[PDB]
């Protein structure tokens, strides 16, 4: 298959959050069939970022998902042509983010072009005050609608102090060619910043994801 057991990653993200505009570039590697990937991220414009890096990281590719043989792999089937996605992120305090990604491959390496945009984040909330610690692990409900794959997941940021900051993800996954469509299933996620420098200009990011029926 064109998706090899080990695939490299390259990405570029341009965006703006509450007016502050930025550019982040990424280099990485992962095992698509194990559902594990690691990314080395770099802020190229807009350092230091005035908002919590956590809101960006799920925007930094469901091809890195361990899929059982009995579930069609919508994402691995889309290649080499690739796929794109569109995501809305509705936070509980009316903060709101919109993101898109265009994913292709070349050789042993994925490429992403990411756009990220957010606004109406309260000036004293956790995102603008950088009071987030991590994303809790989550479960995304995948299901086919309008000939394309859709995913919904309830997300929550653990805050400094112990409380939680909840967000609603709704994503549309559009393959660039015809692929065998699966029925409803779930993807378990865990995303983690392994290491970072003081202002998060250098960040190392890890995700593990596996698909399964309910």
């Amino acid at each position, epitope marked *: 298959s064109v998706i090899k057991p080990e695939m490299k990653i390259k990405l*570029r993200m341009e965006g703006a959050v509450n007016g502050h505009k930025f550019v982040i570039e990424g280099e990485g590697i992962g095992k698509p069939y194990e559902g594990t990937q690691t990314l080395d991220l770099t802020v190229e414009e807009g350092a230091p970022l005035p908002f919590s890096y956590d809101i960006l990281t799920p925007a930094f590719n469901r091809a890195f998902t361990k899929y059982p043989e009995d579930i069609p792999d919508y994402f691995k089937q889309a290649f080499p042509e690739g796929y794109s996605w569109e995501r809305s992120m509705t936070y509980e305090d009316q903060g709101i983010c919109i993101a898109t990604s265009d994913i*292709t491959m070349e050789g042993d390496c994925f490429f992403y*072009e990411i756009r990220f945009d957010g606004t109406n984040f309260p000036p004293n909330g956790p995102v603008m005050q950088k009071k987030t610690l991590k994303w809790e692990p989550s479960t995304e409900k995948m299901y086919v609608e309008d000939g394309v794959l859709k995913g919904d997941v309830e997300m929550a940021l653990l805050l400094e102090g112990g409380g939680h900051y909840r967000c609603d993800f709704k994503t549309t996954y559009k393959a660039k060619k015809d692929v065998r469509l699966p029925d409803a299933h779930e993807v378990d996620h865990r995303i983690e910043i392994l290491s970072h420098d003081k202002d998060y200009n250098k960040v190392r990011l890890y995700e593990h994801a596996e698909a399964r029926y309910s």
Partner: nanobody, 118 residues
Framework: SSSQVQLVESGGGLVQAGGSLRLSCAAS????????MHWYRQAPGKEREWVAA????????FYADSVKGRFTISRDNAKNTVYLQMNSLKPEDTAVYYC????????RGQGTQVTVSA
């Protein structure tokens, strides 16, 4: 197949170290703004080296770490052409340069030669 997509490179030649050179990759058979496109180079004897890449929308550009800062990839959608601007050339940049694209199948140019003198 050559009546489906064609990539035609040009702009190569010989130049002295520290010089400049601007390659062109003229596309035919598909709109250049609908596909990611890459530049490869291949010295004789050694393996091919991925040089640079540009996205469908042209808002993203990627370069190998061996030519960053010096090489620039750009695009003109009206002329349907991808360009590779090469500054501060070094004798190790000596290879045949070609562009490549995937539109249902893999297409590749014939390549233009760049030879850098010491």
């Amino acid at each position: 197949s050559s009546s489906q997509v064609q990539l035609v490179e040009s702009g190569g030649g010989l130049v002295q170290a520290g010089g400049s050179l601007r390659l062109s990759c003229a596309a035919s058979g598909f709109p250049v703004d609908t596909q990611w496109m890459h530049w490869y180079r291949q010295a004789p004897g050694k393996e091919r080296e991925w040089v640079a890449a540009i996205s469908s929308t042209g808002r993203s550009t990627f370069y190998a770490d061996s030519v960053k800062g010096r090489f620039t990839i750009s695009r003109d959608n009206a002329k349907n052409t991808v360009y590779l601007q090469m500054n501060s050339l070094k004798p190790e940049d000596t290879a045949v340069y070609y562009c490549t694209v995937y539109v249902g199948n893999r297409y590749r140019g014939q390549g233009t030669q760049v030879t850098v003198s010491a």
